Amino acid sequence: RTIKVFTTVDNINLHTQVVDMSMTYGQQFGPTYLDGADVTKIKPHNSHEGKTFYVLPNDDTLRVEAFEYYHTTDPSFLGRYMSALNHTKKWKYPQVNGLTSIKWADNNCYLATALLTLQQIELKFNPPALQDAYYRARAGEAANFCALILAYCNKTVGELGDVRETMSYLFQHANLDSCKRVLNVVCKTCGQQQTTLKGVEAVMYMGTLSYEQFKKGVQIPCKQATKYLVQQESPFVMMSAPPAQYELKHGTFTCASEYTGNYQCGHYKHITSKETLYCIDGALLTKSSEYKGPITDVFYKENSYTTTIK
Amino acid sequence: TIKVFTTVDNINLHTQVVDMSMTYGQQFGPTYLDGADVTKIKPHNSHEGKTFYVLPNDDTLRVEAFEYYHTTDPSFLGRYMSALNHTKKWKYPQVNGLTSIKWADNNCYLATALLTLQQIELKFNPPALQDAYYRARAGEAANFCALILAYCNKTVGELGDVRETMSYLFQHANLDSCKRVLNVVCKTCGQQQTTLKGVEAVMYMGTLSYEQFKKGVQIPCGKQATKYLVQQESPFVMMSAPPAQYELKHGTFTCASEYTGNYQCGHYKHITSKETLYCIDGALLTKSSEYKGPITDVFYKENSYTTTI
Amino acid sequence: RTIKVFTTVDNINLHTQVVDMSMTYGQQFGPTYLDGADVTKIKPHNSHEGKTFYVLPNDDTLRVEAFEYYHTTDPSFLGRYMSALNHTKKWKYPQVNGLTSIKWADNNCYLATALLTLQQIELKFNPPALQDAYYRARAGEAANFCALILAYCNKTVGELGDVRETMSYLFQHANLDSCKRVLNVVCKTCGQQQTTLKGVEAVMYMGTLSYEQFKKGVQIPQATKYLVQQESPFVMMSAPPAQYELKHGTFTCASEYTGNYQCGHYKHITSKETLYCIDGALLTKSSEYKGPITDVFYKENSYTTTI
Ligand SMILES: [Cl-]
Ligand SMILES: [Cl-]
Ligand SMILES: [Cl-]
Ligand SMILES: [Zn+2]
Ligand SMILES: [Zn+2]
Ligand SMILES: [Zn+2]
Ligand SMILES: [Zn+2]
């Protein structure tokens, strides 16, 4: 006695199947999932009739569809995505001041901070899987998008996390090709040193948080040199620096990432500049005319910059 | 070959003659020795006449398992044995009459559950859980903990919630004959009374004070309303609320659950009302005439209540 | 279409292999690793030609080589070592005041504290795998050594840890056989009680941190406990974390512990020309130190009491 169901790797190309009720899913399909739940070792139930089941690439049709949708060969990917998903579908994604956040759960403050930021910067993912989920995230269905993020960064639920690290991995799969930065390092001894970055390395800097400062001058070892921004072409810039007490002034930035705690007691909050300043702490929300605290990331809007130096 | 026992329940022992060359796995599939996964190792000497947990791989063991555990989930044993392998190394000291746990692997929430379960009238429907619950009260609380972790799909080290844990456990408790009746009075939308049975009858999330729950509580309807208790029939009630500063007065409650810390830095302590107030913090024990602190659960003794409203 | 690679369990006995490009590694070898990375499920790539791959003991040659090198029959060992390794190779091991530390990651403060201590106390591992890695640790390549420690102690990455617990498991595999301690407990009621410990139990004590005090007298259920004879290159004095003042050059190194439950942090203090506090990649100096200490290591050759 057999029933009718669907298998897929992308949840777009559905493949029609007739499962033997006695035999388990695993026997027939190998690794098999039902909205994250690993159903490899259980046997086809009745309620399953005409439901969609994620399976592993175990033929050429599914090996293509997978790579086409996910832009990855890693045969562990689905496993960890489905694992991640099984948890993230039980997380709460409340609307907070227009934005999909996450109620705090499983040290996920860094995923929340990522998710709030991604809704406020111009960006387009190269993988369909990521672009699709990024749309349905902004809507309010951000479970999938989170699972994919955890998957793409090889993180697991409960694992501690870094916003800046996560943004980096995600910007690999963003279309940032036409983004461009030009930096110049002036020592009176060793002369000049200019660099021309494209892609991810064009938008991210680790050293200071103030973008205005980054244009004027920044002191570094070669004794000391002067680093400044020559040309920036990108829709945003991310300015990261080791967490330090810093005053955020309204409307001088897009959003920021706060980090209290030191080791495994570390917590990210998200600050966003709107009509006034809002601090998004998962499901909780504060307002002030100005903000002071340990900031580690700051995002700034940009179109085209050129410096008035030499 | 040597003589050993396989079982799924550790009650029906099945006599076996294991080939010394071949590993356990080859002969039995997944095989465990007090939690330790011995699927890949070969029968040793010291094993003679020891009891080994195996997976349901025939109809005798498929029945015994479901009869004892009240679940068909073929991952259950795996996670129970995994859990067990750790919990058998935990310390379970007696603290003011009660089996606690020395702090280990973020287990403060299991400790708090365990201390509570010893102070509220309850009967588990699964034998596995009832059996272990008896041997827990005695002092052998390793198994009971493993089963709790198992039944709640938690793993060791995983952060935990007392209230969430109690809920999952009360699913397998016999609470059928428990009954609650609640009434919500708005001057706009009139009256609204509800008749809950089972788990939903004993647990409430909103406020900690049981006395206040009988008088009145304010909630949204585009207006706010008045919620009060009409009838309660159960041996205890659990009053949960988001952790908040609250004053515990001696002998106005059975036990409580305290929660300090915010994100992954959260700690549960257990407070119990006896001749005075005792705070059980794993293996540590304090006493005061009164207590003030962030409480999130309070348990109250009850037989039968009816309101004069 | 096939390429040439090497399989091994010890990375000393290399076994030459010709892998089918279509089939994955797993199909051909079972569990297969490339510097920790589990490559059981991926197929032989291009870059791999003439690289060394860790495999599981799946014949008697590799079952011997493994036990010879690791001194353990636990058939899970390599799995967890390679798993551990896959993370520890991404950790930073900076030099700090002469010593290989670790930048903080995955609650690893206790591994850092162990590692800093092991560089400052005379010790020899019985497993080759551990001695080999302990040399390459002191040099600066401490990824392997850490993986092996995590492996040998049945810990995983991110798992919370105890310095004293870790030292114990490690001293099992240290050659401490000729180490010896003699303790005497004097009650005016129940008379005298002396004990003769050898091996690991000879160097470790849980009760107080002061070695000088341990020689004079210590009160227990009361009675008086004192050290009669000590023969070992170091002693470890552990006690539940408590405020304690460290005086320069009265000890080798210590272990600090702030925090209570899962918020606990180990720092390492070392006595050199002055006092240095190693907190992973961070470094402090003071003329004196006061803080919650739980372990203190002392240099010793041969002690005998005048009591
Ligand atoms: Cl947040
Ligand atoms: Cl507790
Ligand atoms: Cl350290
Ligand atoms: Zn210069
Ligand atoms: Zn109303
Ligand atoms: Zn913490
Ligand atoms: Zn005595």
Short mmCIF file of C-alpha atoms in Angstrom, two decimals, chain A residues 56-304:
data_model
loop_
_atom_site.label_atom_id
_atom_site.label_comp_id
_atom_site.label_asym_id
_atom_site.label_seq_id
_atom_site.Cartn_x
_atom_site.Cartn_y
_atom_site.Cartn_z
CA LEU A 56 20.07 14.79 -0.88
CA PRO A 57 21.52 15.06 -4.41
CA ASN A 58 21.49 11.26 -5.24
CA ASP A 59 21.18 11.69 -9.09
CA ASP A 60 22.30 14.17 -11.86
CA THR A 61 18.94 16.10 -12.05
CA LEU A 62 19.20 16.96 -8.27
CA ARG A 63 23.02 17.56 -8.43
CA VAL A 64 22.37 20.34 -11.07
CA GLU A 65 19.20 21.90 -9.44
CA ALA A 66 21.12 22.08 -6.07
CA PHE A 67 24.22 23.90 -7.52
CA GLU A 68 21.95 26.11 -9.75
CA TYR A 69 19.93 27.28 -6.65
CA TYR A 70 22.58 27.24 -3.80
CA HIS A 71 25.84 28.04 -5.78
CA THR A 72 27.75 25.40 -3.69
CA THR A 73 29.09 21.81 -4.25
CA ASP A 74 29.43 21.03 -0.47
CA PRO A 75 27.51 17.72 -0.03
CA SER A 76 27.02 18.52 3.74
CA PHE A 77 25.21 21.85 2.92
CA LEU A 78 21.54 20.63 2.91
CA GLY A 79 22.08 18.53 6.09
CA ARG A 80 23.21 21.65 8.06
CA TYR A 81 20.63 24.01 6.39
CA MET A 82 17.80 21.52 7.29
CA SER A 83 19.34 21.10 10.82
CA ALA A 84 19.57 24.92 11.27
CA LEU A 85 16.02 25.27 9.78
CA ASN A 86 14.50 22.70 12.25
CA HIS A 87 15.35 25.24 15.09
CA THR A 88 14.91 28.66 13.28
CA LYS A 89 11.26 27.78 12.33
CA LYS A 90 10.52 27.82 16.16
CA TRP A 91 12.19 31.27 16.67
CA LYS A 92 9.93 34.38 16.83
CA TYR A 93 10.48 37.10 14.12
CA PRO A 94 8.52 40.13 15.41
CA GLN A 95 8.28 43.40 13.44
CA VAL A 96 10.23 46.11 15.38
CA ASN A 97 10.02 49.73 14.03
CA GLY A 98 9.47 48.40 10.46
CA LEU A 99 12.15 45.66 10.61
CA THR A 100 12.17 41.85 11.05
CA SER A 101 14.20 41.13 14.24
CA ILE A 102 14.40 37.84 16.26
CA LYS A 103 13.37 37.19 19.92
CA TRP A 104 16.63 36.21 21.73
CA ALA A 105 17.29 32.40 21.52
CA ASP A 106 20.43 30.18 21.12
CA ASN A 107 22.96 33.11 21.20
CA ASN A 108 21.25 34.46 17.99
CA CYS A 109 21.74 38.23 18.78
CA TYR A 110 24.43 38.28 15.98
CA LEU A 111 21.97 36.79 13.38
CA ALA A 112 19.31 39.34 14.53
CA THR A 113 21.90 42.19 14.09
CA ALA A 114 22.89 40.87 10.61
CA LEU A 115 19.18 40.54 9.61
CA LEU A 116 18.27 44.10 10.80
CA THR A 117 21.35 45.53 8.93
CA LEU A 118 20.63 43.56 5.66
CA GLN A 119 17.15 45.25 5.53
CA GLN A 120 18.83 48.75 5.53
CA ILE A 121 21.71 48.40 2.94
CA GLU A 122 21.39 48.08 -0.92
CA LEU A 123 22.57 44.48 -1.74
CA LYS A 124 21.74 41.62 -4.22
CA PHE A 125 22.65 37.92 -3.56
CA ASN A 126 24.09 35.85 -6.47
CA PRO A 127 22.54 32.55 -5.18
CA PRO A 128 18.77 32.38 -5.95
CA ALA A 129 18.28 30.50 -2.59
CA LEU A 130 19.71 33.58 -0.74
CA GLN A 131 17.90 36.29 -2.84
CA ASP A 132 14.53 34.37 -2.64
CA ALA A 133 14.89 33.97 1.20
CA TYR A 134 16.07 37.66 1.57
CA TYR A 135 12.76 38.86 -0.01
CA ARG A 136 10.61 36.51 2.17
CA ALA A 137 12.74 37.69 5.19
CA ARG A 138 11.84 41.43 4.72
CA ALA A 139 8.16 40.25 4.49
CA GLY A 140 8.33 38.41 7.88
CA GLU A 141 9.17 34.74 6.90
CA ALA A 142 12.88 35.05 7.97
CA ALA A 143 13.22 31.43 9.26
CA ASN A 144 14.59 30.11 5.90
CA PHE A 145 16.93 33.12 5.32
CA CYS A 146 18.48 32.60 8.83
CA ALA A 147 18.94 28.80 8.25
CA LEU A 148 20.70 29.59 4.92
CA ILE A 149 22.93 32.22 6.68
CA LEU A 150 23.89 29.66 9.43
CA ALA A 151 24.43 27.09 6.60
CA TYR A 152 26.53 29.41 4.32
CA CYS A 153 28.76 30.44 7.35
CA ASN A 154 29.20 26.77 8.53
CA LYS A 155 27.78 27.83 11.97
CA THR A 156 25.26 25.73 14.04
CA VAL A 157 22.43 26.89 16.38
CA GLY A 158 23.65 27.94 19.89
CA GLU A 159 27.21 28.51 18.50
CA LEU A 160 28.46 32.06 19.43
CA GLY A 161 28.75 34.43 16.45
CA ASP A 162 30.33 37.61 14.99
CA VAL A 163 28.24 40.13 12.94
CA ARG A 164 31.34 41.33 10.94
CA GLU A 165 32.52 37.72 10.21
CA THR A 166 28.93 36.81 9.06
CA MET A 167 28.61 39.97 6.83
CA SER A 168 31.97 39.04 5.17
CA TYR A 169 30.90 35.44 4.21
CA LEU A 170 27.48 36.82 3.00
CA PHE A 171 29.14 39.61 0.88
CA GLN A 172 31.08 36.79 -0.96
CA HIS A 173 27.65 35.75 -2.41
CA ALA A 174 26.52 39.42 -2.86
CA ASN A 175 27.07 41.04 -6.31
CA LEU A 176 29.63 43.72 -5.22
CA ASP A 177 31.88 43.37 -8.36
CA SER A 178 31.39 47.04 -9.51
CA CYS A 179 32.25 48.33 -5.94
CA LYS A 180 35.73 49.98 -5.79
CA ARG A 181 37.93 51.63 -3.08
CA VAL A 182 41.30 53.51 -3.35
CA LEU A 183 43.47 53.94 -0.15
CA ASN A 184 46.80 55.88 0.23
CA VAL A 185 49.40 55.40 3.09
CA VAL A 186 51.90 58.37 3.35
CA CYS A 187 55.16 58.03 5.41
CA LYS A 188 57.80 60.84 5.05
CA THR A 189 60.44 57.98 5.13
CA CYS A 190 58.96 55.19 2.86
CA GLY A 191 56.91 57.56 0.56
CA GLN A 192 53.41 56.59 -0.73
CA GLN A 193 51.38 53.27 -0.93
CA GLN A 194 47.97 53.23 -2.77
CA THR A 195 45.80 50.05 -3.09
CA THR A 196 42.85 49.36 -5.52
CA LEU A 197 40.36 46.84 -3.98
CA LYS A 198 37.25 45.49 -5.81
CA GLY A 199 34.42 43.21 -4.51
CA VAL A 200 33.90 42.46 -0.75
CA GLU A 201 37.25 44.05 0.38
CA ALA A 202 36.07 47.45 -1.11
CA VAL A 203 33.15 48.01 1.41
CA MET A 204 34.65 46.47 4.67
CA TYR A 205 37.42 48.02 6.86
CA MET A 206 38.74 46.85 10.29
CA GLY A 207 40.55 49.69 12.21
CA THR A 208 38.18 52.64 13.08
CA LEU A 209 34.36 53.31 13.12
CA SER A 210 34.28 57.03 11.98
CA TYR A 211 33.96 57.32 8.14
CA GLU A 212 34.76 61.09 8.22
CA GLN A 213 38.03 60.25 10.11
CA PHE A 214 38.84 57.57 7.48
CA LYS A 215 38.77 60.35 4.78
CA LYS A 216 40.97 62.85 6.75
CA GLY A 217 43.73 60.64 8.30
CA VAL A 218 44.42 57.50 10.42
CA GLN A 219 47.84 56.65 12.04
CA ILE A 220 49.38 53.10 11.61
CA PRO A 221 52.86 51.46 11.89
CA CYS A 222 55.02 51.16 8.66
CA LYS A 223 57.08 54.48 13.61
CA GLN A 224 53.78 55.79 12.15
CA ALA A 225 52.17 56.48 8.70
CA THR A 226 48.91 58.26 7.57
CA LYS A 227 46.06 56.22 5.91
CA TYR A 228 43.17 58.07 4.11
CA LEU A 229 40.36 57.30 1.59
CA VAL A 230 41.09 58.53 -2.01
CA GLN A 231 38.04 57.19 -3.95
CA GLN A 232 34.96 55.16 -2.77
CA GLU A 233 32.33 53.76 -5.25
CA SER A 234 29.70 51.56 -3.41
CA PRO A 235 26.12 51.94 -2.01
CA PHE A 236 27.30 51.45 1.65
CA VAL A 237 30.56 51.10 3.65
CA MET A 238 31.03 48.96 6.83
CA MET A 239 33.46 50.42 9.45
CA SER A 240 34.48 47.78 12.08
CA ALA A 241 36.87 48.24 15.08
CA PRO A 242 37.43 46.32 18.38
CA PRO A 243 34.44 47.17 20.65
CA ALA A 244 35.04 50.58 22.33
CA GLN A 245 32.93 53.28 24.09
CA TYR A 246 31.69 55.61 21.25
CA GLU A 247 28.92 58.30 20.86
CA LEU A 248 26.53 57.81 17.87
CA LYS A 249 25.07 61.14 16.59
CA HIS A 250 21.60 60.98 14.91
CA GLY A 251 21.61 60.87 11.06
CA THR A 252 25.47 60.66 10.66
CA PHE A 253 25.17 56.87 9.91
CA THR A 254 22.60 54.25 8.72
CA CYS A 255 22.84 51.52 11.46
CA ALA A 256 25.48 50.19 13.94
CA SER A 257 26.27 47.01 15.96
CA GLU A 258 26.79 47.26 19.78
CA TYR A 259 28.74 44.53 21.70
CA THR A 260 28.69 44.27 25.55
CA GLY A 261 30.54 41.39 27.32
CA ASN A 262 34.04 39.97 26.68
CA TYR A 263 34.27 36.16 26.15
CA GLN A 264 31.15 33.86 26.03
CA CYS A 265 29.07 36.54 27.92
CA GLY A 266 29.11 38.77 24.76
CA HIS A 267 25.81 40.34 23.49
CA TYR A 268 25.07 42.30 20.23
CA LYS A 269 22.34 44.98 20.10
CA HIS A 270 21.44 46.88 16.86
CA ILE A 271 21.20 50.73 16.69
CA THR A 272 19.47 52.39 13.68
CA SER A 273 19.24 56.15 12.81
CA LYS A 274 15.65 57.10 11.74
CA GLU A 275 13.56 60.17 12.83
CA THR A 276 15.45 59.60 16.17
CA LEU A 277 17.79 56.77 17.42
CA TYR A 278 16.25 53.28 18.01
CA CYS A 279 18.12 50.46 19.89
CA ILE A 280 16.77 47.04 18.72
CA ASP A 281 17.64 44.31 21.31
CA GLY A 282 15.90 41.29 19.68
CA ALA A 283 12.17 41.75 20.55
CA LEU A 284 12.86 44.83 22.79
CA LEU A 285 13.03 48.46 21.53
CA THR A 286 14.42 51.72 23.07
CA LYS A 287 14.60 55.38 21.83
CA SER A 288 16.99 58.32 22.65
CA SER A 289 17.97 61.66 20.94
CA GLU A 290 21.65 60.42 21.17
CA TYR A 291 23.41 57.06 22.04
CA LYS A 292 26.70 56.07 23.82
CA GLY A 293 28.06 52.49 24.24
CA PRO A 294 30.50 49.81 23.00
CA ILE A 295 30.10 49.90 19.14
CA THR A 296 32.07 47.46 16.87
CA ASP A 297 30.35 48.01 13.42
CA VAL A 298 28.88 51.16 11.76
CA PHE A 299 27.25 51.19 8.26
CA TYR A 300 27.26 54.46 6.18
CA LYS A 301 25.36 55.32 2.93
CA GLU A 302 27.65 56.22 -0.06
CA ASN A 303 27.29 56.78 -3.87
CA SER A 304 30.64 58.21 -5.12
#
